[PDB]
From a paper:
We have established a solution-phase macrocycle synthesis strategy in which three building blocks are coupled sequentially in efficient alkylation reactions that eliminate the need for product purification. We next applied the strategy to synthesize a combinatorial library of 3780 macrocycles, which we screened against the coagulation protease thrombin, a validated target of anti-coagulation therapy. Screening against thrombin yielded a potent and selective inhibitor (Ki = 4.2 ± 0.8 nM) that efficiently blocked blood coagulation in human plasma. Structure–activity relationship and X-ray crystallography analysis revealed that two of the three building blocks acted synergistically and underscored the importance of combinatorial screening in macrocycle development.
In contrast, the amino acid 11 is d-β-homoproline, which has an inverted stereocenter from the l-β-homoproline in the parent compound 7. It suggested that the two structural changes to the parent compound 7 acted synergistically, and that macrocycle 57 would not have been identified if the two building blocks had not been altered in a combinatorial fashion. Most likely, the two β-homoproline stereoisomers in 7 and 57 imposed a different conformation onto the backbones, which altered the positioning of the N-substituents. As a result, the furfuryl substituent binds optimally to the S4 pocket only if the macrocycle backbone contains d-β-homoproline, and conversely, the hydroxymethyl-benzyl substituent only binds well in the presence of the l-β-homoproline (a detailed structure discussion is provided in the ESI†). Inhibition studies with macrocycle 57 and a panel of nine human proteases, which are structurally and functionally most similar to thrombin, revealed a high target selectivity. Macrocycle 57 prolonged aPTT and PT in human plasma with 1.4- and 1.9-fold better EC2× values than its parent 7.
Numbering used by the authors:
A (entry chain A): 1C, 1B, 1A, 1 to 14, 14A, 14B, 14C, 14D, ...
B (entry chain B): 16 to 36, 36A, 37 to 60, 60A, 60B, 60C, 60D, 60E, ...
Write the structure that this text describes.
Amino acid sequence: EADCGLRPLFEKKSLEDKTERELLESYIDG
Amino acid sequence: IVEGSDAEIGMSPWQVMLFRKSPQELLCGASLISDRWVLTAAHCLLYPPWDKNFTENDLLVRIGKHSRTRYERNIEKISMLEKIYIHPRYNWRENLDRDIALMKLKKPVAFSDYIHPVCLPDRETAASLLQAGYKGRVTGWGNLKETWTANVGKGQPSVLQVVNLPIVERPVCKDSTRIRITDNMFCAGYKPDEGKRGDACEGDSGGPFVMKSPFNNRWYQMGIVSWGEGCDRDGKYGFYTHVFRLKKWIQKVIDQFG
Ligand SMILES: N=C(N)NCCC[C@@H]1NC(=O)Cc2cccn2C(=O)CN(Cc2ccco2)Cc2ccccc2CSC[C@@H](C(N)=O)NC1=O
Ligand SMILES: *[C@@H]1O[C@H](CO)[C@@H](O)[C@H](O)[C@H]1NC(C)=O
Ligand code: NA
């Protein structure tokens, strides 16, 4: 609903998965 | 998923398995977009060339799973389907244009640590995130490679597989295939000279292509695994249903029947 897309075992506990950084890097790096 | 890796537990809580009821058979990936709605590829339900024509009663879904085959008590949940909705202008003949379907759960599913919905994108998120070279994430329990071999056959995984792949320029997409592609699909994958690889594969059909917004930290489903020429071939790309472009159809259906 309004809580969509925030994962109980990651975002909600301030924890990152092992590869999400790769996506963020793709947004920034030329 | 070809050239992916084991998912972490609860990495993809919106992940859904689509099964044929009888005989029991994993058909496709899918995703949870609300407590009672599941998104998937139209071709998972209807594909004349392959004699596929499933209706609500032929199917069930499994939510919260990690392992492909093991039963996972107190984590996974099973649901039947009230109705199936295939996009009226789905074109299986020419180009799998509008390869999208919605599945209403007969009974709402309970959210948990292992079961949580994904966001559908608004105009801004789509316009911001859907750019050539930006990567999304594809997940599924489909085959590990295109061709059969003796080592577990075509290779099927123990646990949910994950791979990240960059969105590709539409000219490159269009040049890669004889098929007349439309604005309702995009393509993703490394180029030959990029020297990373990865792709969806047979059985990943209908599962989600997700991106994490750096604006609000939320995961959005931009794509549905749709079609490709084999898996992980050089100079070929996976095609994905453009979720944002079909959001009005999604919303009209959720409104009129939910
Ligand atoms: N690598 C991926 N990300 N995904 C591909 C998984 C793996 C992929 N499978 C699908 O996409 C299956 C599917 C569901 C519904 C259709 N549809 C098809 O194969 C349909 N055509 C013809 C077509 C294209 C657009 C509209 O219809 C795919 C195709 C396109 C161009 C040239 C050849 C082909 C057939 S390639 C061999 C074929 C097979 N003999 O299994 N398919 C695959 O290898
Ligand atoms: C699929 O099955 C239903 C009957 O359950 C039928 O009414 C429909 O026309 C079929 N679609 C085809 C053959 O394309
Ligand atoms: Na490729």
